[PDB]
Structures are given as C-alpha cells and as structure tokens.
C-alpha cells in the first residue's frame, strides 16, 4: 500500500510526482504514524526539503539516478553530516557528525534524500530499540511487543510504511532480527563486502570490527538488491538463479543450543515445502554441516572480545594478541567447513529466531531475561545460535517475511548462502515469496 | 620472444600444439636454462605430463577453459597436493601439502598445468631467494645479483622465459621487488581481494595475513588481468581507461625516510613524461598526500607485530589486544587519507625500490646491511619506505618493466591506484608500456 524505493524513483522520473512531493508525503506519513511507534527519532525535515528541491532541479535537467529524490532514513549509528550520532548513549547525545558515512555518501550519490535517523538501543547491544536519548520503539503489529534490536527503528519505519528503504548493521542479528520481528526484508551482507566507514563509535573514528556487517533493509527484494549495488565496495556477482527448480536446500528447524516455536517450525517447513513443489530438493541433514554447537561457542567468545575491544573485566588477564590470532584461525577454519557444505547446497533454510517479537523488557542483563516457547520457558541468550552461523562464517543471510503466528506477530525466514553470493540470497528470497503465493 | 599464457592457450586451442607438447616445451626450457638461475626448485614434471594429457582429452571434448594446457609454476609457499611446502626451512623440507591451495585450485579449474614451484628465502623474510633446501636463485640478467625477494624464483623463471605465468605473495614488497629485480610484471593486489587459503605456514593452517596479499606475476599485463579474474574472491571491476589522455598522475621520486638512485629516478620520470606526451596530467606534489614518514613507521610497527604473531621478546612487553585494535584504527585512518588523495589522482608513479638488484648478501640481519646509491652508501632497511604505501594502505600496486640501469639490471615502475582498482593498475601499466614504444 506504500511505494517501494524503486517505484518512488520511477514516479519522480515519470512525472506523476516531484521529489519535493515524495519528501512531503513521507514526512506526512512519519508525523501521522510515528506517535505510537517512535521509530524516526532524529529528524532533518528542513534540510531534506531543500535536498528534494535540488533533486527536482536534477530531474528537470534530465538527470537520472537510481534513487533520485527517494525519501529514506538510516540507522542512528550511521554518521550523517550535521546530525547527532549517539548510539543511544546520553554521554554521546550531543556528538554531531561532521561528515557523511560511506553508505550515506553512496546513497546520496544515487540521489537519495535522508529525512532522519531510526532508533537504536544503548550501544547497539540489544534485540530491542530503546535508549535514554530517544525513548522506545514499539512494534507496529503489536505496540506491546519489541520492534527488534539496533535496526528495530529501521524495521518499524518500513513496517509502518513511513519510508521505503533503510540501512542497518549486524554483529549479533541486528538486521535479521528486527526484520523478523516487524515482518520486513533485511539482508545481512557478506563480511567485508560493505565498508563500515562512518559507522563510528561516537567521538571516535573506529568503525571496523570483526563479525560486524552493514546491510540494506526494505519491503521488496528488488530494493535490497539495488541498495546493495549502490553500497558495496565493488559490484557483487549478480544472481543467475531464474527459478527454484534444481535448487538444493538444507532445512534446519533444530539447533543444538537453542529451540524454535512450533509455529516458527511449521512456517519454515512450509517455505521448504513450497520450494520442493517448485522443483527444489530439500534435505534435512548433512554430514558436511559444521558443528553448530562448537560454532556458537567460538562465536560468543570472539563476540565478547570484539565488543570489549580486548579489555578484560574484574582483573581477569586479557586475551593475548597471539591468542586473538589463533581465534581468527579458528574462524577461518570454520569458514572452510561452510565452503564444503555449500558445495552440496545452494541455501540453508532456518529460523531467524526461535520465536516472534517478545514483550518489552527493562532488564539489560540477558541472563536475567527469558522467552516463552509454546508456553514454556526458554533461555534468552541461547537464541543467538540461529544468528551465529552467518555472522561467524561471514556468509550472507536474508531475513524475509513468511507470515505471522497465532497472535498476529510476524515470522520471518532466514536464508543463508555461501560467502559473496548476496545476490543469490535476495534472488532466492524473491522466489520463495512467489512460491508461497501459490 | 617466448609465448605468453594467453598466447599459449590460443595455440593449444587452435591446435598449433597440444597441451602435452607445450608442457614438454616448458620442461625443456627449464632443463636448458635453469642451471645458472636455480629458479624452478620443486619439479613435478611427471604428474604435470599426465595433467597435460588430461587437458588434451578436454580439448578433444571442446571444453572451454581460459588457461587449458598452459604450463606454469607457483611460488613454493603455496600449497600443492603432493608437493613440499617448506618456506625454505630445513625442518619443513619434508612437509607435504595434502590439498591444493585456493589459488592453485582456481588456476587448475581454468585448465592450468603446474610444472612445479619456484625458489624462496627462508621464511619469505628477504629480498633475495636463497635457503638450505634448494640453494640460491641468481638474477638472469646478472648472475652475481640477487633475483628479488620471496618471489625471486617466480620472477627469474619468467625473466628466463621458462614459464609464461606465475603467482607470488607480498607483505613487504615480495611481488613488486622480485619483478623489479628481474624486469617482469607483478601485481600486488588490493588487500583481501584474493584468498590466502593454502598459503599456509608449514604444518599449520594459518594464512595469518594482515598487510599480506597474493597476486599474479607474468610477462604481459593481459596475463595478469586473466590470472586476477581467475583467482580473486569476486570478479573485480574491469577498467574503463581506454587511453592516457586525462589521466591524473602523482609522480613521487623522493621519500622523507629513504632514497632512490639517479638511474631509478630517471626511469620513473621517463614513464610520467611519456604519459604527459600522451595527454596525461602529471603533478609532483599534492596537499592530500599523507605523511609517508608516519606511514612507514606505523607500517613497520604493524609488520613486526604480524610477523611475530603477537609474541614479544622476554625483556619486552607484548602489544596488547586493545593496542592492536587501535593500530588497526590507525591503519584505517591512513587508508581514508589515500581515499582523499585518489579523489584528485588516478595513479601514483614511484619507484619499486631505491636501487636495482644488489649483489648476493649472506648477512641475514638487515641492520648489518647497506646499499650503494650513486656511489654513496645507504641503509638497507630504510628501502621499505617505497613499498609501505600500497601495503599499509592496502591499495593495489603494479610493478612493470621500464628499462635497465648502466649495468643492465632492470628497473621497474610502481603504479599505485586506489583500493579495488587492480584492473586500473594493470590497464595504466599496459598503456605506459605501449607509450614507451611508439
Ligand atoms: N550479543 C549481542 C546480540 C545482539 C547485538 N546487537 C547487534 O547485532 O549489534 C549490531 C551493531 C553492529 C556493531 O555492534 C549485540 C550483541
Ligand atoms: N621486514 C620484512 C619482512 C618480510 C619481507 N619479505 C617480503 O618482501 O614480503 C614477504 C612476502 C610473504 C607474504 O606472506 C621483507 C621485509
């Protein structure tokens, strides 16, 4: 019911609307809908209106750019010149960026118009989006449920239909989990495929961090593919998959360290069944699948060190630099195991998370949180296992809508493909989405 | 005089010769010429001839592979199943690799036939190729002079016309310097563009590389372009440079912490002056060129930490993991400085090294060494400055033949271009070559 980013760019080139009109309608949707959601927490409406006029001048001057005049937002952690980058920290609430980030620079060169920035948790360290500077973002499908983490403001903006395109970052599921919670499309990209420059920790110039990636978020896979081509360091190989027949799928509905809803399991099997009916082959086990239990142990270990920048708590000896090199070897080994698995399979079908969006939690300690799995208690932090494979291995993982649970909360599919095949992930997701309409 | 890898592939495809004949012709050239050179130190001739026969069964099957039946060698540090990978250590002379390295695997899938492996220094830690397992590689242009360091076997084997194609590695100039010492082509690739898998330290699986890149070595720029497209993780963007008119070049012939000799300065200026004659704009300074003295200091500090795998002497403190992360931020700061410089410039023209191939030295400590620069003595290790920019900044850098000094020792130009523009570096070098002809 809302214009996609590509449709918007065509509507401005095609003449039925101007870049200023596209920007004032987006502002109008933001103001008419954000009240109960609280997604667009930084607003730059006057500078955006001037950018739209400049875009219409380019449109008048016969200039055509793939995203020309398209209004959009970006996650609050990405630097935009003249805007605050806080990461949810009150200490950093007044840190104003003096230059655009690389991803914003690429999208602005494609002609995009940035209206503001979307909400995040403190330090981008939660699966919900709430912080002292901006407040809390509420899921648009259920205001009592969380809207996902770090990219949750982005996903709630797309789900509420305010803007057609968004961009997030993902060190522990922050593109896929919000897209899952809010039923939108999110692409965790191949590690090192998109520059993090400008995704700086506030008041620093440190943006590069292992396991972490930045990726597009939208409501259509065509929007993800185009935003990825605009933002990637180099053009990534386009997908040659025309249809689903012959596709080899490994379907994972179980994990050795966590669990999934029965609604989540049925949804993921229905996606595999719909592709099976479209000529794909679906396996449910493989001798080549790496040890998912050892994976999440290595992953959490490396994740803790990266977030602590090596510093060690409570007088513990810090991990040595020599041991950090061995951990990178452990990761590299694990990536080779996934290359062998991806010789037999084109994609992994698995949950994004074990359950749908949980009710708002004021508890910062994940060990003190809990989840309800079919009316039973499950550990909160153990759910990181579904996220760990694509993050630790570097593989791209797509989170795409599959439907909703009995309570009307969205359930998304995760599609994991081999490294550097991001366009295959998008292409397969589009075909799955069509196969479910059958 | 000798055929190139592309030319060789065409002759086999056309049927001017079979793959077995091209293989036997290469074996004969090695047996006739390697005697005084000692470049092809690991020989796999019998397995290569069976592989050549298999390639002919595929020419008869009309299979299309861009390197089918093309004989070549690889640097000894790359793994080949069944062949030793010692890195010049006597203790590792019997370490037999159990699987092909990735780069070997890619070239073989393109149809290349591997005759063997070329000589290296102990631990790849010098600008000459000499080790207890295999002996020393002598420069083909002057047997009293070193053949380049760590790829000297590769460069010398191409300079002697034994094989059309090779492949090296580079952390401190080891593609560029051997190519300069022997007057062949060598592409130092953008960091993280080609996989180091199989370039393992003997008896380990540790590619372990920061600042370390693998890239092809050949006698023609088109051979490098083909080898780069076969081996890169992802197809790199092709060059759009049709000619030299409009090319912005920044020529450096001085460096705040090192020196070059006059014959070397004269060749680099001759390449720029010939690009000027073809329509390129040349500058000899820029407000955007970062501090090369700070660069070489930080590069040396990172190089040593990387080579020591984080270990420190018993009297010194090890660099902490947190300090290592800050050093990676320092590198990212330097790379962004080169981004801005490359907004004003398409390429940098500079020396590969200050001097041509020096006489064989048996002194392992670089601090106890020194070079002769136009009759004057100069410290040996300071010459790491010319190499440091592309390795620290990660940029691609090509080393291409320009001429020779008064003793007939070749001189190469280093062409540095912005990150991910490896094909632009190849393309400019090819253009410079055709400008220095007509
Ligand atoms: N254990 C844990 C789980 C989820 C997150 N959220 C996240 O994915 O961060 C994305 C921001 C990229 C740079 O941090 C963090 C930690
Ligand atoms: N300090 C210093 C250390 C090493 C070299 N050798 C070199 O040129 O690169 C080595 C290529 C191996 C890549 O794994 C020179 C100086």
Could you tell me if B50 and B174 lie in one domain?
Answer: yes
Q: C-alpha B406: how far from its chain's center?
A: 24
Could you tell me if B214 and B260 lie in one domain?
Answer: no
Other CB atoms within a 10 A radius of the CB of residue A44 amount to 18
Q: Which of B174, B202, B231 is the last residue of a domain?
A: B231
CB A185 within 8 A of CB A399: yes
Give A201-260 as a DSSP string.
PTTS-----TT-EEEEEESSHHHHHHHHHHHSSSPPPPP---SSTT-EEEE---BTTB--
Could you tell me if A264 and A117 lie in one domain?
Answer: no
For the record, the structure tokens of A101 come out as: 């980030």
Other CB atoms within a 10 A radius of the CB of residue B220 amount to 19
How big is the CA angle at A168 (ends A89 and A192), to the nearest 5 degrees? Answer: 110
- Whose alpha carbon is nearest atom 3 of ligand 2? B125
CB B383 within 8 A of CB B372: no
CB A385 within 8 A of CB A296: yes
Resolution in A: 2.3
CB A402 within 8 A of CB A268: yes
Structure-determination technique: X-ray
- Domain assignment present for residue A238? The answer is no
- Domain assignment present for residue A158? The answer is yes
**Which of the 8 DSSP states describes residue A360?**
P
Could you tell me if A189 and A256 lie in one domain?
Answer: no
Q: Which of A182, A205, A231 is the last residue of a domain?
A: A231
Question: Measured on CA atoms in the order A13, A16, A20, A21, is the torsion positive or negative?
Answer: negative
Could you tell me if A113 and A24 lie in one domain?
Answer: yes
Ligand 2 — pocket residues by CB below 6 A? B 124-125, 149-150, 169-174, 212, 303
Give the separation between CA B344 and CA B339, rounded to whole angstroms: 9
**For residue A73, which of A137, A123, A11 has the smallest C-alpha distance?**
A137
Give the separation between CA A136 and CA A130, rounded to whole angstroms: 4
Could you tell me if A205 and A311 lie in one domain?
Answer: no
- Domain assignment present for residue A242? The answer is no
For residue A350, give the 3-state DSSP assignment.
Answer: strand
Nearest-CA residue of chain A relative to B232? A420
- Domain assignment present for residue A304? The answer is yes
CA distances (Å), origin B71, targets A352, A385, B151, B349: 48, 47, 18, 33
Place of tokens 């197809």: B235
- Domain assignment present for residue B226? The answer is yes
Ligand 2: residue of B122, B123, B150 to mutate (most ligand atoms within 8 A of CB) is B150
Min distance B356 CA to chain A CA atoms (Å)? 36
How big is the CA angle at B293 (ends B377 and A197), to the nearest 5 degrees? Answer: 150
Could you tell me if A34 and A151 lie in one domain?
Answer: yes
- Mutation pick from B322, B335, B337, B419 vs chain A, by most beta carbons of A within 10 Å, is B322
How big is the CA angle at B302 (ends B297 and B306), to the nearest 5 degrees? Answer: 150
Chain A (369-428) residues lying within 8 Å, Cβ to Cβ, of chain B: 419-420
Q: C-alpha B33: how far from its chain's center?
A: 22
Min distance B409 CA to chain A CA atoms (Å)? 38
Give the separation between CA A219 and CA A229, rounded to whole angstroms: 17
Could you tell me if B172 and B303 lie in one domain?
Answer: no
- Domain assignment present for residue B227? The answer is yes
Q: What is the dihedral of CA B1, B4, B8, B9, to 10 degrees?
A: -160
Give the separation between CA A226 and CA A68, rounded to whole angstroms: 13
Could you tell me if B109 and B143 lie in one domain?
Answer: yes
Place of tokens 């400049």: A54
Give the separation between CA A239 and CA A287, rounded to whole angstroms: 27
Give the separation between CA A111 and CA A90, rounded to whole angstroms: 32
- The active-site residue out of A101, A150, A151, A399 is A150
- Domain assignment present for residue A240? The answer is no
Could you tell me if B215 and B274 lie in one domain?
Answer: no
CB A355 within 8 A of CB A264: yes
Question: How far, in Å, from the CA of A124 to the mean position of ligand 1?
Answer: 5
Other CB atoms within a 10 A radius of the CB of residue A329 amount to 15
Could you tell me if A193 and A124 lie in one domain?
Answer: yes
Could you tell me if A220 and A264 lie in one domain?
Answer: no
How big is the CA angle at B213 (ends A339 and A239), to the nearest 5 degrees? Answer: 40
Full domain range(s) for residue B20: 5-193+210-231
Ligand 1 — pocket residues by CB below 6 A? A 124-125, 149-150, 169-174, 212, 303
Active site residue A150: yes
Which CATH number characterizes residue A430's domain?
3.90.1300.10
Give the separation between CA B357 and CA B351, rounded to whole angstroms: 13
Buried b (16+ CB within 10 A) or exposed e, B122-132: bbbbbbbbbbe
A325 touches chain B (CB under 8 A): yes
A305 touches chain B (CB under 8 A): yes
CB A84 within 8 A of CB A5: no
**Which of the 8 DSSP states describes residue B277?**
T
Min distance B76 CA to chain A CA atoms (Å)? 22
- Domain assignment present for residue B242? The answer is no
For residue A340, give the 3-state DSSP assignment.
Answer: helix
Active site residue B75: yes
Active site residue B65: no
Task: Kindly list the residues from chain B whose CB atom is less than 8 angstroms away from the CB atom of residue A324.
Answer: 310, 321, 324
- The active-site residue out of A65, A75, A117, A188 is A75
Contact state of A325 with B234 under an 8 Å Cβ cutoff: no
Residue B243 backbone phi and psi in degrees, to 5 = -160, 180
Give the separation between CA A229 and CA A236, rounded to whole angstroms: 7
Give the separation between CA B332 and CA A207, rounded to whole angstroms: 9
CA distances (Å), origin A98, targets A78, A79, A80, A81: 12, 8, 8, 5
Place of tokens 């095949």: A421
Domain count, chain B: 2
> Which residues have CB under 8 Å from B318's CB, separation 6+?
A320, A321, A322, B310, B311, B312
């Amino acid at each position: 019911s809302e214009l996609s980013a590509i449709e918007t760019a065509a509507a401005i080139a095609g003449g039925s609307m101007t870049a200023l009109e596209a920007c004032d309608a987006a502002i109008a949707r933001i103001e008419q809908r954000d009240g109960p959601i609280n997604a667009v927490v930084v607003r730059d409406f006057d500078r955006a209106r001037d950018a739209a006029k400049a875009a219409d001048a380019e449109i008048a001057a016969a200039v055509r750019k793939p995203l020309l005049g398209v209004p959009m937002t970006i996650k609050e952690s990405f630097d935009i010149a003249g805007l605050p980058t806080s990461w949810g920290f009150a200490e950093h609430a007044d840190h104003i960026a003096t230059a655009d980030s690389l991803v914003v620079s690429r999208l602005k060169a494609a002609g995009a118009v940035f209206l503001g920035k979307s909400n995040i948790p403190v330090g981008l360290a939660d699966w919900q989006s709430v912080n002292p500077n901006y407040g809390r973002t509420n899921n648009p499908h259920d205001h009592s449920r969380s809207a996902g983490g770090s990219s949750g403001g982005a996903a709630a903006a797309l789900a509420a239909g305010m803007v057609p395109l968004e961009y997030g970052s993902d060190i522990g599921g922050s593109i896929r989990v919000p897209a899952h919670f809010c039923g939108v499309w999110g692409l965790k990209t191949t590690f090192d495929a998109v520059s993090l420059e400008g995704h700086y920790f506030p008041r620093t110039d440190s943006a590069k961090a292992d396991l972490s990636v930045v990726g597009p978020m939208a409501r259509t896979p065509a929007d993800l593919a185009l935003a990825l081509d605009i933002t990637s360091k180099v053009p990534l190989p386009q997908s040659r998959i025309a249809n689903l027949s012959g596709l080899r799928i490994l379907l994972l509905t179980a994990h050795p360290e966590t669990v999934a809803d029965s609604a989540t399991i049925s949804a993921v099997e229905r996606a595999a069944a719909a592709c099976e009916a479209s000529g794909a082959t679906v396996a449910t086990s493989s001798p080549d699948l790496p040890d998912l239990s050892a994976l999440v142990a290595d992953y959490t270990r490396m994740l803790l060190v990266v977030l602590a920048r090596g510093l060690a708590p409570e007088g513990t000896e810090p991990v040595s630099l020599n041991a950090w090199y061995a951990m990178l070897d452990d990761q590299a080994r694990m990536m080779r195991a996934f290359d062998r698995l991806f010789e037999s399979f084109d994609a992994i079908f698995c949950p994004v998370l074990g359950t749908t969006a949980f009710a708002h939690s004021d508890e910062p300690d994940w060990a003190k949180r809990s989840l309800s799995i079919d009316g039973g208690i499950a550990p909160f932090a153990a759910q990181l296992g579904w996220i760990s494979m694509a993050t630790y291995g570097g593989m791209p993982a797509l989170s795409m809508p599959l439907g909703a649970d009995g309570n009307g909360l969205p359930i998304n599919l995760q599609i994991i493909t081999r490294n550097w095949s991001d366009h295959d992930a998008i292409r397969i997701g589009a075909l799955v989405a069509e196969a479910l309409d059958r």
